[PDB]
Amino acid sequence: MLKYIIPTMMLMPLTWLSKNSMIWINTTLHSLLISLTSLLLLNQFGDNSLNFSLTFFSDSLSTPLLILTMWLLPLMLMASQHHLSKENLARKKLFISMLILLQLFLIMTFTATELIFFYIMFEATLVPTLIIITRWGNQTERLNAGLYFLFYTLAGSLPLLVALIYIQNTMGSLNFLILQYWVQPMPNSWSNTFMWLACMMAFMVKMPLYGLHLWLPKAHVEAPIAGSMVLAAILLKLGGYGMMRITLLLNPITDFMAYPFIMLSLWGMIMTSSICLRQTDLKSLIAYSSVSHMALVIVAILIQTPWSYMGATALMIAHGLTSSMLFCLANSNYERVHSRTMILARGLQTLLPLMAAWWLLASLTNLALPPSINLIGELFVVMSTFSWSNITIILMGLNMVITALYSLYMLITTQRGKHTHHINNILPSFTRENALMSLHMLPLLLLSLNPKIILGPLY
Amino acid sequence: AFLPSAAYLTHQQKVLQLYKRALRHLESRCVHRDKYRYFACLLRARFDEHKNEKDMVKATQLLREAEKEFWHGQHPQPYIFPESPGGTSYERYECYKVPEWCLDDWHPSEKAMYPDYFAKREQWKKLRRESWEREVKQLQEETPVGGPRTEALPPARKQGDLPPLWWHIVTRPRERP
Amino acid sequence: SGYTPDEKLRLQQLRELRRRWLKDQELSPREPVLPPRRHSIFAFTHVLIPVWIIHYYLKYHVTTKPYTIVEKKPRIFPGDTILETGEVIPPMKEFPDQH
Amino acid sequence: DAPPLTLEGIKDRVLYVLKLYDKIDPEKLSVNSHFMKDLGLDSLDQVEIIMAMEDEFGFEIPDIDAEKLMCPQEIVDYIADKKDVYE
């Protein structure tokens, strides 16, 4: 994995020694070269994972999240370069350095052989994201979110730390490869119940869980575009990756500890999708859509069937691409009308036809139009949860109505109807913006041809 | 009720509007033209029976139970004209009604495709910008204290000036682009 | 009552401006100034070359793989002659005629 | 389809409707004949004339404008406004 970490670190002398008009071009070029390099991780096997060293490994779960992570950096550099034009050059290089450092943390978070190195890199990803959100977020009003981050630290990552140190003392190792063969059944006891909550609640907030999703339509709103792209595309999926690693140790107690949280997600995707029908803020609507889609990944991990893991990792990759494109479309209107109000600028297909085509395609991938991998992930999760319980199809299908309903409403409000009269700064689409939409959508459409590379280790 | 110029409906306006809506809903009830024309003169006689009513309270009550008569006898789906609100062709071409300022955002290679049009549009915009401050200083000395009472605007008073708040009414899109 | 003289004057002035705008939306005889830029080729490009491509695909890549094109076996009647064998199927029983 | 309207056409059609009306004589009717004061009609008759215009041209005049059209020239000017004639 050291053929990826070292070029990502060499992006730091590349971004600090570059000429002042060249720092976007150079970082975009070399991060696209790293993303082309990232396809060497597709050397996967039907029995063995790709095990590089004592520190790094890659099965077919971590590999597509790595490719999506290394692909997300050039797109963030394209998306965030317009609204940093009047920024200081040194502050602009600090922004690019925090993006590069976040990629550096993520690409060795997903490959972490041992679980406390996963914990260190997992909680290391929060700091450059925090600095990007609070130094370039264009407004900061976080009176209620401070107490929620305190709740995240109390109920989340610290019990995970104590639990992983406990497994280190009990099993003697936290290597996931060793824990594949030295796993003991975790029986019914109160010690094992608090053990399960400690191993799971950090990743429950990171997904997020319904009821615990209070941070996500704030942190998505108060962020720049690169921060919202990396939150929607990668930083939610650390929770799902960590659940799919840590549920190896949590058998068979998961088979009766999943029942509350499954309810919290199965009803929760009914609520948040419905919440998207009453959103004034477009970026908040995409945030609650992200909650409504990660609820299915929570259910699919907690029911731990093969079809559910295949659908959950396909849904993670697909929703990463789709929701990142949705935030980029929301920014491509916000950079013109200077307000996130979804009822402000209407009828935009009269003014921007190709951009409305991109809105249509991102909406159709948002509502899981087949054969897109949004639908493949959605569908396999629905099949596995039907095998879990035959009634849940109702709570699936009703969600699959409301998921359609706000997806086209977001299309109908922003793009259709009568244009707003008093807005006359609606410029034509820059080639940068259309390139950003295409570099989201065309990989998402090409993955419908060959979905087997995004269906996880047990395809 | 809700009008741009008047804050209410006069009783004369209420009578005329109820007569018109009664005839329209009647024509919806009474499809054939000679049959509707017969019942239309009958209904005109019914409206002209109490045309000469001096008492405005009695005329108010008669108008009220006439509204009850019209509501009891209304058609469920009355004939709406196609480009009337509620019609089948209503606001159909609003997706083709591009605002004029978008011509400002064209590329010069396609602005040069229509040279006379934009060469005239330059002096249209010139006319607008040398009319604007004159019509603002026209409106600031005629508007009473507290703002204007009614939404109606005064016309161009001097010769050479243009009427105030005129550009979006003149340069509005055509109804069939 | 109709309009006021102020409203009639404003409608006349706006109407003159509106008709000038609509008349000045017309086109010049040179406009648009454009920049300076086989009877049955349809059945060749759209049919015959795709029939070639799809016949090559089905003949050398699809039917060369097992069970890809599975066909219902043809309907055999009494009296038929089998081409793979040379065997004549015998007829039915003689009819207990009804009419 | 959809033939262009002209002020000659709109004028001749509005006067053609009003000359088929049994309370307006066809010899006193001009292009500036006021309905209440010059032709001596009722507001009920004026509403019937605006509804006849709606029957003639295939669209609707709203009541806030139907209460003020008090000559055939105002009718021709209003249809000129709502149809964009003489492009």
Binding site: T350, S429 | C102, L103, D105, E110, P173 | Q25, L27 | -
Partner: peptide, 13 residues
């Protein structure tokens, strides 16, 4: 004759 100009946004970009 009487060709009319159709206002539309810039299809160049």
């Amino acid at each position: 004759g009487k060709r009319l100009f159709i206002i539309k946004p810039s299809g160049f970009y």
